[PDB]
Structures are given as structure tokens and as C-alpha cells.
Amino acid sequence: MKTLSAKPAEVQHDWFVVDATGKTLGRLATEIARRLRGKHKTSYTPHVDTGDYIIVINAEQVQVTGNKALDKKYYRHTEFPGGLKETNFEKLVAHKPEEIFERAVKGMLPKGPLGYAMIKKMKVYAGSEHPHAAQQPQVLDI
Amino acid sequence: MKVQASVKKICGSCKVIRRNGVIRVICSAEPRHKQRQG
Amino acid sequence: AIGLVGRKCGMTRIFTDAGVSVPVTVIEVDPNRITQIKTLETDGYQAVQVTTGERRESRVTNAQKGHFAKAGVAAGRLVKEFRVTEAELEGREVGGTIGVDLFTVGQIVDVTGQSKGKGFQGGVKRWNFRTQDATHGNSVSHRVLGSTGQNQTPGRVFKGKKMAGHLGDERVTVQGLEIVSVDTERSVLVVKGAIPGATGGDVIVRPTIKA
RNA sequence: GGGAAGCCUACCUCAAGAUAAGAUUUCCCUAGGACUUUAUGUCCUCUAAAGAGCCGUUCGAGACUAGGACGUUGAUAGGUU
RNA sequence: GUACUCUGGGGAUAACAGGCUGAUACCGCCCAAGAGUUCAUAUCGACGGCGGUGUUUGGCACCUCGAUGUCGGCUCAUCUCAUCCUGGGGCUGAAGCAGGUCCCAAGGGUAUGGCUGUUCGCCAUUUAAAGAGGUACGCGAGCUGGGUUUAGAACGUCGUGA
RNA sequence: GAAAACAAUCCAGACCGCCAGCUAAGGCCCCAAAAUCAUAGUUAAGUGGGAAACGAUGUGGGAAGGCAUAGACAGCUAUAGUCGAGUCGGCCUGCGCGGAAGAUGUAACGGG
Ligand SMILES: CN(C)[C@@H]1C(=O)C(C(N)=O)=C(O)[C@@]2(O)C(=O)C3=C(O)c4c(O)c(NC(=O)CN5CCCC5)cc(F)c4C[C@H]3C[C@@H]12
Ligand SMILES: CN(C)[C@@H]1C(=O)C(C(N)=O)=C(O)[C@@]2(O)C(=O)C3=C(O)c4c(O)c(NC(=O)CN5CCCC5)cc(F)c4C[C@H]3C[C@@H]12
Ligand SMILES: [Mg+2]
Ligand SMILES: [Mg+2]
Ligand SMILES: [Mg+2]
Ligand SMILES: [Mg+2]
Ligand SMILES: [Mg+2]
Ligand SMILES: [Mg+2]
Ligand SMILES: [Mg+2]
Ligand SMILES: [Mg+2]
Ligand SMILES: [Mg+2]
Ligand SMILES: [Mg+2]
Ligand SMILES: [Mg+2]
Ligand SMILES: [Mg+2]
Ligand SMILES: [Mg+2]
Ligand SMILES: [Mg+2]
Ligand SMILES: [Mg+2]
Ligand SMILES: [Mg+2]
Ligand SMILES: [Mg+2]
Ligand SMILES: [Mg+2]
Ligand SMILES: [Mg+2]
Ligand SMILES: [Mg+2]
Ligand SMILES: [Mg+2]
Ligand SMILES: [Mg+2]
Ligand SMILES: [Mg+2]
Ligand SMILES: [Mg+2]
Ligand SMILES: [Zn+2]
């Protein structure tokens, strides 16, 4: 009919690079999730992926407020009896910052095949260097 | 140390202090006056 | 650490002057030939690759033939790596040999092997479960598992429950063994105690890491 | 700053279906025509290597599988000494 | 009268287990007259007061009566900490050796026999210790069937008798 | 439609069709439609997002008192001496803190 949905073949995916130094995790993750889902484009379609690629550098410099550095705890469960594993943000940001960003953005993306497709477009690196110079990403601040 | 919800000064050598959000009483004279809680 | 690859040859005894009988296992060692050296630059970790034994030409594929020819050593029946540090790599080069003199009498070592396979086994043998009454009205329940869980709470069987299954035929390491003899002429190591596996099996001897 | 049989490492085993499917060494394949819906396109003619499996003699491997050794350039099994 | 029993029905309505509640039960706190040779608060603590748990005896009848079949033992377990041993600490009416009380800590470990069907309980002898609880008072399409609750028979008692 | 799920709660009473508009309860950072809206304050406990008697120099705002630079309070010297301005002890009131131990798995904002 007259309201047309975006065709996946016709979608273009740009590449942006973001520095995470001295930024709040949640308020950065909201913008990251928005851009990954594609809400910023006027051709937004709920059943199609129209987002852009987002590279995150300096991930270990991400900050939290209050006492959350010591008090925010991350959990997982091995399906063995009594197998609950428990850690802290201070240790997790030192060990696997990519896990920090992955959890933060997964919590905000939809839960399904399309959400799994969208999350693959986020690239997270601890250092200030990334291996995608061939894609010529543009600087984006959010 | 006495751990108890109600903590008060016992004598003039007792002092009330706060440490990391915990209320304690420290006595210079009588060690048995040392208290923590509440 | 750098170690040796050998074959289990059997058990025997050694008599001391006082007359004490020391049980021992014999490990025959064909001297190990170095095939490749791995480094941080090329592989990201430091290891030494060795081969031992012999293999007839018809059983060596072309790829392995080229791999052996690059190091200029004869093909063996197996290839194994030892993780090493910077110091150990010194004096080691492709084409070199590790014989038997790497060890000394009285040194504590660890021995790794492949255990004998017992096939499919039950709880009594695999997990040391206790049997039920043989008499006093027991019908058909002597070596059975018994109860395997609770009631509707939790309503399932917890994962990792001990049950009947395959037993043996696994990698096993024994620590705290002592070198009783280092026969260079015969190229054998005689170690105190028992080691995993059957006669004719491949075994790995390494310096102990708990010392 | 100190600080516990407690936590993360440390010892043993498994582990890239880790779909994020990783790394290293070595080896193999280097031919022609027709057609159209112009494409890692479909057909024929010619070639099929490095290897893997089937099959056999078997095992200290094994429910069946899987796994290990060997098949005349041989000691894999039986016999014989 | 029926336990020699039978049919139509009900979870509209009891016994087991689950559910709501927490009078009762267990545990933790507030006040401090007193006991502590003098000193309330080392150890206790009168008369009174406020909470927590869902571990007891109970209340209600919400699920199951075209069926949710078990008291104890055996076998195999998993979890909580209000911690029995082991580990780290404060106070002491802590000389030392040993104790008392409180805080942190759940990694591992945490008896065999005599008697009764016993769960318990008393007893003998060990151990560093022989912890308290939840899981349909864990576990009977995994085992047993001693207690208990069909049909036989006997005693005491009750009834004229069944 | 809202309260995550949720006969008995809040809004609202479905004749049928529309890829049109305005509102109710409830909401506007993302899952997920709408303010990363504007001006003043409070909270530091993730309180918000379970909670009692009672305990406390947590932090704000009020109406009153004793003392005091002819020298107040706290420290030091043997009621006095040098320091050189605020200092003491109560009554209300907003928001916060301890009291706070359980059994498959974080499990007391639906999640981030
Ligand atoms: C079903 N809906 C309405 C709620 C809902 O939706 C949610 C949810 N998570 O969704 C739920 O919490 C609820 O269902 C629930 O069950 C609640 C409570 O327990 C409870 C409570 O117990 C007491 N305190 C007392 O009653 C003390 N007694 C009274 C006098 C002395 C003894 C006070 C109190 F405000 C509550 C709140 C309710 C809320 C309710
Ligand atoms: C946010 N989430 C966790 C809930 C949620 O989602 C909802 C909702 N409607 O959705 C809410 O009700 C809640 O936020 C909430 O606030 C509740 C309570 O009040 C409350 C309660 O008060 C008392 N008991 C007493 O208070 C009095 N006792 C007497 C002695 C001491 C205390 C007992 C009790 F179990 C509760 C339940 C909570 C539930 C909570
Ligand atoms: Mg076997
Ligand atoms: Mg038999
Ligand atoms: Mg039978
Ligand atoms: Mg039998
Ligand atoms: Mg013979
Ligand atoms: Mg009937
Ligand atoms: Mg009913
Ligand atoms: Mg009942
Ligand atoms: Mg029920
Ligand atoms: Mg009850
Ligand atoms: Mg009624
Ligand atoms: Mg039925
Ligand atoms: Mg039961
Ligand atoms: Mg059963
Ligand atoms: Mg019987
Ligand atoms: Mg009769
Ligand atoms: Mg509700
Ligand atoms: Mg709610
Ligand atoms: Mg709904
Ligand atoms: Mg109408
Ligand atoms: Mg409008
Ligand atoms: Mg939106
Ligand atoms: Mg809260
Ligand atoms: Mg409430
Ligand atoms: Zn005092």
C-alpha cells in the first residue's frame, strides 16, 4: 500500500567510531542501541535492520557514578547444582570491558533473531586502535 | 566488643564515633565499654 | 617444561644393599628429534615440538613428509609439543636430539599416560556405590542405582549426577615419582612406582611442577 | 597499610557448535566448446589430484559405533620352531 | 449392627500432603529492680515492652474423592546457616594450661554396637567433631513391609444380642 | 487500555468497515509510543525499589535561651596567665542511617 517498508537489499550501513573515555555507561549505551537499531533514520522499519556499525575504543575508561564501581555485581549460573558465579565491575572492567558493553547493549536491544543480528554490528576494543581502517569509519560523539 | 542495637556512653571516658556508616563507642578507660551497632 | 616421550616396557623390582625391594617401571626412550620451534612472533607462545619412533613410508602422507623434510629428520609414529620458557629454548634447534640424560637419579618427575579401558560400567565399580541386601526379601535390586532425586521439588535430575557409563581410557598424570635409574647405553629410564596404561603404551615424562 | 581452612588465581581433566566457529607447519588441483535468463550462470567433451571411505588380518579399544596397528615394499592374526 | 458388605453421588464435606494465617512453637531485640565478696550490663537477670522464621500444636476448607497409594529402615542425594570440628578476631570475675560470652567464616569433614517395628529414647565403647533444619515431615513406575488399617482366632473390658 | 504476569482494583460499556483525528486511567533514557523538557529546592542511602520498639555530633529549614573581644569554649602552664569570636545545652520540622538470619539460581524497580 502507500506506506512502504524498507527493503533490506536497499539498506546502506555506515561506519562510526566512538571514544568511551570519561562517559557514563548507560547514557552511552542508549545512543549506541538507538543507532544500532536504526531509529535515527526516516526509513525505520521494526522488522528490518537499518542501523549502522559502531566501533567503541578506550572501553576500559568507561565510568559509573556513586559507589557502583564496587557495588554493581555481575552474575552468571552454570547449570550445575549450586553453580552461581559472581563478580564486580572494578574487576570486570579490568578483565573484559567488551563483556561490560555487550551486557549493557544487549539489555537494551530486542530479544530475538533480529536483535542478535543488530548486536553483531557493535565492535568493542579496549585500546585506542581498531582493525577496521579499511572501512574508513567517521568520528561520532554520543 | 559488644554488638548491640542500642549503644550509649557509659562513662566520661566513652566517645561516640561513626565509621563507614556504623556507630561505635570507644572507651579510653574501660575496654569492656567498647560497643558497635545501630 | 621440556620432557621426554617414551614407551612403557613393563614392571620389575630393584634390590638395595640393605635388601629393600623397590618396585619400578621401565620406560624405553627412542631419542626425541626436534621438528619445529614455536615462538611469540610466529605462534604467540613458546613450545618445542618433537617426534619419536619410526613409520613406514606408505603410512606417511605427503603433507607430513614435507613437514618432516623441512626439519630434516626421519618420520616418527607420533608428534608432541612441550611448552617452554625462554631459558629452555637455549641450546635447542630444529634437527636436535633429546636423549635421556635430561634427567638424573633421584629427581622427582611426573608421568602422564593413557589408562586401561574398562568399557561400560555401573555405579559399584565406577563410583563405589554400595549394594543392597542380597537376602531378606530383596527382589531384583542388588547393584542398581537406587533413588536418583527428590520429589516434585525440584522435579528433575541434577546435571552431574553419578550414573553408569564408560570408565577408563583417559589421560592420567601421576606426580611425585622418583628416577631410580638412567641407563644411557640401553636408553631407558627406571622410575619408582606404577604409571598409567598398559604395556606398549606411550607415556610422557616431565620434571615435577610441585617442587 | 596489615588481615582467615572463606573469593579469584594456583594443582588435575575436558574444552573453538567460543555460529565470536580462532592460530601455526606442510601438501594438492594451473583443460576446451555451445547457449542465454549476463552470471562464483546452464550444458556438454576431456580430466579427477592431495586425501577419505568401502573391504580384509586384528587389538591391552569396544554394546553397536567410535578409536589404535597392519594389508606382500608384510610380522596384522593363526600355525610352526 | 455390619471389619461379610453393595449401588448412585461430593473435593458442595473430613483423614495425608500443598495453600492462607501465625493464637501456639522457636529465635532475635528494648528498659534495668536485683544476683554477681564491693560493681546492673565478665556471666546472668525480676515486672513489662517490640520484632523475625515458617522448623511445632493449632485455625480456615482454597486444589485433588471418573484415586495426589507409605510410619520406619535401605540406596542415592541437593540446599540454608540460627556453626559441632577445623580457620581468623573483641571482651573477660582472661597468670599459664583450660574455660565463658560475642563477631567473621558454609571449603571440607561431621561413629559402631545392646534393647524396641520404632522416628526418638536409655545404655557400652570410640572420635577433632558424632551440628540444627528445608527439599510431597527428599527419595516405595529404585528395594523392603517390622508398626499400622480388610477377611481367621483368643484374652481384658463394654452390650440382652447382632 | 492501565496495575510485569494478575475474574472481584482504576479508566471505560465492543452493530460492521477505514493505513483519519481528540482524549480517560497511566505515562514520555532504551527494550517500547511520547520531554535525555523548563524553573526552584532535598537526598548519597541504589534510599528510590519490604519494615517495629529503640539507638546516634548524618544532613537541610525554623522559633526561642546561657555566655562573649572591661575578653566566651577547647587545648597548655601554676581559682590566674598567653591564644584571639563566635561558642554552648535544649524544642519543633524535611529527607536519610542501624535494628534486618533460610533453604533449586541473581530472585524485595519487569529488565538494561
Ligand atoms: C496485589 N497487589 C495489590 C500488590 C502487588 O501486586 C505486589 C507485587 N509484587 O506485585 C505485592 O507485594 C502484593 O501482592 C502483596 O502481597 C503485599 C504485601 O504483602 C503487603 C504487606 O504484607 C503489608 N503489611 C502487613 O500486612 C502487616 N499486617 C497488617 C497489620 C499487622 C500485620 C503492607 C503492605 F502495604 C503490603 C503490600 C501488598 C501489595 C500487593
Ligand atoms: C517492589 N517489589 C519488591 C514489591 C512490589 O512490586 C509492590 C507492588 N504493588 O507491585 C509493592 O507492594 C512493594 O513495593 C512493597 O512496597 C511491599 C510492602 O509494603 C510490604 C510490607 O509493608 C510488609 N510488612 C509491613 O510493612 C509491617 N511489618 C510490621 C512489623 C514490621 C513491618 C510485608 C511485605 F511482605 C511487603 C511486600 C512489599 C513488596 C514490594
Ligand atoms: Mg578394554
Ligand atoms: Mg551372585
Ligand atoms: Mg514380588
Ligand atoms: Mg536375586
Ligand atoms: Mg611351543
Ligand atoms: Mg461407590
Ligand atoms: Mg473445596
Ligand atoms: Mg491440611
Ligand atoms: Mg495440592
Ligand atoms: Mg499447618
Ligand atoms: Mg465459605
Ligand atoms: Mg484423571
Ligand atoms: Mg516423605
Ligand atoms: Mg516415587
Ligand atoms: Mg505387617
Ligand atoms: Mg467371621
Ligand atoms: Mg501487582
Ligand atoms: Mg510493581
Ligand atoms: Mg497486558
Ligand atoms: Mg454498545
Ligand atoms: Mg494528541
Ligand atoms: Mg520511543
Ligand atoms: Mg531497595
Ligand atoms: Mg510497601
Ligand atoms: Zn567507658
The domain limits of chain A are: 1-142
To one decimal, the resolution in angstroms is 2.5
State the DSSP code for C101: T
Strand partners, A75: A86
**How far apart are alpha carbons C14 and C22 in whole angstroms?**
5
E strand bases under 7 Å from protein CB: 29-31, 41-42, 74-80, 89-92, 102-103, 107, 135-140, 142-145
C97–chain A nearest CA distance, Å: 41
Q: Are strands C108-114 and B14-19 parallel, antiparallel or unpaired?
A: unpaired
**How far apart are alpha carbons B35 and B14 in whole angstroms?**
10
Residues of A with CB under 8 A from a CB of C: 79-81
Residue C110 contacts residue C172 (beta carbons within 8 Å): no
Give the number of C-alpha atoms closer than 13 A to the C-alpha of residue B20, restricted to the C-beta side.
2
Which string of DSSP letters, residue by residue, matches C31-79?
Answer: PEEEEEEE-TTTTSS-EEEEEES---GGGS-HHHHHHHHHHT----SEE
Q: Which residue of chain A comes nearest to C156, CA vs CA?
A: A81
Using a threshold of 3 CB pairs under 8 A, tell whether chains C and A touch: yes
Could you give the maximum distance between any two Cα atoms of chain C, in Å?
Answer: 73
Give the nucleotide nearest to C197 (CA→C1'): D60
The technique by which this structure was obtained is: cryo-EM
Q: Is the Cα torsion angle C112, C116, C120, C126 positive or negative in sign? A: negative
